[PDB]
Amino acid sequence: DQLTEEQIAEFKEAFSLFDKDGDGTITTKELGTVMRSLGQNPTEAELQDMINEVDADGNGTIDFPEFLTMMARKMKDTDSEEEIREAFRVFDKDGNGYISAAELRHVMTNLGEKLTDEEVDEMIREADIDGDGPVNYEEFVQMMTA
């Protein structure tokens, strides 16, 4: 099926987050650094397992063709619940079941998104369906669904 230049560019940008030194491969060391910056604390075994799951030629790192194969295949799946749950956990780093403005700002800055403070407020507000302030899981699911 179609994989446009724009779609590949989006997947390259996702790759580039993990490729911290820009050399074209994701290492276990880089994977753990990013995952900790995103509020998680995986063990060494868990990181190597993740590398091994994507590393199709077994040389110990993930290159972009390997990454693209994995992402393009997942894109064909009609159900995105697991990916949305994982995305929620990245934002909800204290695990209390809702995303605050501070938590959204934190992810924003880590990804280099350069939103203004008013823009941070706006993203939270536009996702806050029930109007109580922060973004809960149901609100996050509804926003992230295609």
Partner: protein, 34 residues
């Protein structure tokens, strides 16, 4: 380890997040001429 079972979900999640920000910024900026 069983981390292999959630690995695709975690890599795809960061794509979903980057897309969330990208689409918002695109909507904000659309049509502006500097």
């Amino acid at each position: 380890s069983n981390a292999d079972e959630v690995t695709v979900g975690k890599f795809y999640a960061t794509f979903l997040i980057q897309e969330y920000f990208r689409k918002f910024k695109k909507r904000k900026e659309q049509g502006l001429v500097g």
